[PDB]
Every structure is written in structure tokens, then in C-alpha cells.
């Protein structure tokens, strides 16, 4: 592998270069909002983002070293967490607002549009506020997003069949080293480094929470059959049902 042979700066540059683009929604400001259309916009956007996420995951150091089955499992577990941390990162400079797309900027009042979404919106807004007060850096963000991909499914996978999971943990350790390197570079003392590292990883627990809640809302959206879900998204939804 080559993921274990990267320096911290090389890890950062690799992650930054692999960043997916910011997509636009099909938001038509002339069309009156309805719960069906509004949710259609978000699910359409996620579907198009999923394609880029998959090809982004391939560029995450260590990810291609995993089996195809393991790659599938990791993305199935983490895809909504990854969408969400991307959302809250984009929304940092927009207090009280969620930037789903450059042409789709929403507050909680437009979340009431949809039964159940207001609670999710508030949680996402709070996460974004937390990032803003911590002054999350782009270099830290790409580290955190890679951690989510590798960590979220690593405990739900035998034999060896262990060196594969052990490999993921070595890569995760490398990313931890990279985070510490970034913080030392920013002039933080050792105590401040360990504290900020803790603060950042504890936010991932809340992102998991939001993802879990979100998946339940979505599964609800499949049973109403009023909001049209793509085939990839449905196949991402059923994976959490099993």
C-alpha cells in the first residue's frame, strides 16, 4: 500500500485534490414550493452527489486497498453522514441557513415545509454553528470526512478478514497524525492539540445521530411514495434496513 507511506502534508494535499465539486439543485424560484417538490430537490441533489462521492472515496488513501465488498459496505453506512458533514461545512459562512446548493439556501421556516425535517434542520444548523465557533479549517474538514468514510462501517463487517480491518485502523491512525500535524502547524500547544482533536471527533457522534434520524425520515419517505427516490438512493436506503 501507499497510504501508509504518505507524510502529513501529502495526506492533506491528496485529500484536498480529491474534493468533489459543489453541485447545483434544480431549484426553480418561479415554481411555488410544496413538500413533494422541496423534498424532490434534496433527494435529486443527493443522488447526483452520490456519484461524485463514490469516485471521491476511491481517492481516499487506503480505500482502494479494501475489497469491493468492504468498499460497498463502508459507503452504504456512511453516505448520509458524508453528505451531511459536507452540507454543514458549506453552510458555515451562512448563519441560520443551510447551503444545500449555491442556488438552494434554506432556513428552518422552509424546513417546516416537510413533516419531520425541522428537527433535522435544527441539528444540522447547530453542527454548522459549532464548526463556525471552532473555526474549522478546510484541511481539518477533509480529514474528518475521510475518517467518517473509514470509521462508520468498520465495526459492522471471520479469518484475516482482520488485516483488512487492521489496515483501516492504520489509515485512521495516519489521519489522526495528520490532524495533530495541522494543529501543531497552527500554533496550538500540545494540550490544545489534544483538546481540539477530541472536540472534532465528538462532533462525529452527532453527525452519526443526525444520519440515523435522517435515514428513518427517508425510509418514511419511501412508504409515502410521494417523494420520488432514485434507484441508487433506494438501494442505499434498504442497506440500512438490513
Amino acid at each position: 500500500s501507499l497510504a501508509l507511506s504518505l507524510t502529513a502534508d501529502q495526506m492533506v494535499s491528496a485529500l484536498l485534490d480529491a474534493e468533489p465539486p459543489i453541485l447545483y439543485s434544480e431549484y426553480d424560484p418561479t415554481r411555488p414550493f410544496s413538500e413533494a417538490s422541496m423534498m424532490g430537490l434534496l433527494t435529486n441533489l443527493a443522488d447526483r452527489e452520490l456519484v461524485h462521492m463514490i469516485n471521491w472515496a476511491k481517492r481516499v488513501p487506503g480505500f482502494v486497498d479494501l475489497t469491493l465488498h468492504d468498499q460497498v459496505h463502508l459507503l452504504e453506512c456512511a453516505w448520509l453522514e458524508i453528505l451531511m458533514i459536507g452540507l454543514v461545512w458549506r453552510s458555515m459562512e451562512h448563519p441560520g441557513k443551510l447551503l444545500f446548493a449555491p442556488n438552494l439556501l434554506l432556513d428552518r421556516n422552509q424546513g417546516k415545509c416537510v413533516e419531520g425535517m425541522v428537527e433535522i434542520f435544527d441539528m444540522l444548523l447547530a453542527t454548522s454553528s459549532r464548526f463556525r465557533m471552532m473555526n474549522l479549517q478546510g484541511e481539518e474538514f477533509v480529514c474528518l470526512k475521510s475518517i467518517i468514510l473509514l470509521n462508520s462501517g468498520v465495526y459492522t463487517f471471520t479469518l484475516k478478514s482482520l488485516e483488512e480491518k487492521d489496515h483501516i485502523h492504520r489509515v485512521l491512525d495516519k489521519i489522526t497524525d495528520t490532524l495533530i500535524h495541522l494543529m501543531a502547524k497552527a500554533g496550538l500547544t500540545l494540550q490544545q492539540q489534544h483538546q481540539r482533536l477530541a472536540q472534532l471527533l465528538l462532533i462525529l457522534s452527532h453527525i452519526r445521530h443526525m444520519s440515523n434520524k435522517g435515514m428513518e425520515h427517508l425510509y418514511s419517505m419511501k412508504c409515502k411514495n410521494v417523494v420520488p427516490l432514485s434507484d441508487l438512493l433506494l438501494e442505499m436506503l434498504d442497506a440500512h434496513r438490513l
Binding site: 456519484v51 463514490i54 469516485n55 469491493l68 468498499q71 460497498v72 459507503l75 441508487l232 442505499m236
Partner: peptide, 10 residues
């Protein structure tokens, strides 16, 4: 197989 499986493959 799965769509995700396909996209990861290509």
C-alpha cells in the same frame, strides 16, 4: 450486482 457495486467497479 448493486448499483453501488457497479459504480465502484468502473
Amino acid at each position: 450486482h448493486k448499483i453501488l457495486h457497479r459504480l465502484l467497479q468502473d
